[PDB]
Amino acid sequence: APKAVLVGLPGSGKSTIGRRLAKALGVGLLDTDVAIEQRTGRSIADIFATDGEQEFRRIEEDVVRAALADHDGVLSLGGGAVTSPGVRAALAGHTVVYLEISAAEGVRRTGGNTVRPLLAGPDRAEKYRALMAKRAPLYRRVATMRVDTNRRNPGAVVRHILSRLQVPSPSEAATLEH
Numbered sequence: 234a235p236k237a238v239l240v241g242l243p244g245s246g247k248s249t250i251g252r253r254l255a256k257a258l259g260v261g262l263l264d265t266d267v268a269i270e271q272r273t274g275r276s277i278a279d280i281f282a283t284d285g286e287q288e289f290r291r292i293e294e295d296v297v298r299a300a301l302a303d304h305d306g307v308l309s310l311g312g313g314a315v316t317s318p319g320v321r322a323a324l325a326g327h328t329v330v331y332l333e334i335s336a337a338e339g340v341r342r343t344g345g346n347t348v349r350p351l352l353a354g355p356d357r358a359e360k361y362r363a364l365m366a367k368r369a370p371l372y373r374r375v376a377t378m379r380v381d382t383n384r385r386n387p388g389a390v391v392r393h394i395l396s397r398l399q400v401p402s403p404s405e406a407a408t409l410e411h
């Protein structure tokens with residue numbers, strides 16, 4: 234089972250923390266969005282446009298379940314996987330690290346806000362606020378560790394996680410005797 238499954242909004246650090254944590258632990262890194270593309274030979278966008286969100290979620294759930302079973306390293310989940318009840322079921326029992334971020338920081342860390350075409354319509358910051366409102370409660374539900382990334386740089390985030398993922402060595406005593 235993965236050492237850690239990372240979940241969070243866009244810009245929360247799934248890629249950055251994924252790499253740095255996997256480096257610190259000396260383990261493999263798998264991202265479920267990349268894994269879907271690798272297993273199908275189709276872009277995420279194409280699967281959505283062509284098959285619809287529900288079939289994307291189906292493919293996604295199979296990939297997530299396989300990775301939870303087979304991957305021993307760090308796993309990062311695509312943002313919407315937790316919307317599938319079967320994915321929430323599959324995660325139960327795993328180490329699930331929720332990288333927390335505010336709307337303002339999430340927008341900044343994903344390229345900033347956009348020009349607003351119509352005063353009466355929404356801008357990028359407002360769309361992000363909507364995604365947060367819907368996703369954040371689900372990340373909270375599935376989490377076993379919550380880490381605020383708003384005021385910690387990536388090195389600090391990784392050190393915080395490592396301090397809470399420790400594994401005692403069962404052969405520790407004997408090692409000192411040989």
Ligand SMILES: Nc1ncnc2c1ncn2[C@@H]1O[C@H](COP(=O)(O)OP(=O)(O)OP(=O)(O)O)[C@@H](O)[C@H]1O
Pocket residue numbers: 241242243244245246247248249250312342343382383385386387390
């Ligand atoms: N703890 C942090 N403090 C400050 N900046 C950060 C932190 N974590 C990540 N960043 C920066 O925020 C940006 C987005 O990070 P990253 O791509 O890792 O997020 P992500 O969760 O993978 O996003 P996406 O869901 O779009 O794949 C990058 O420029 C990265 O350097």
Ligand SMILES: [Mg+2]
Pocket residue numbers: 247248249
């Ligand atoms: Mg990423």
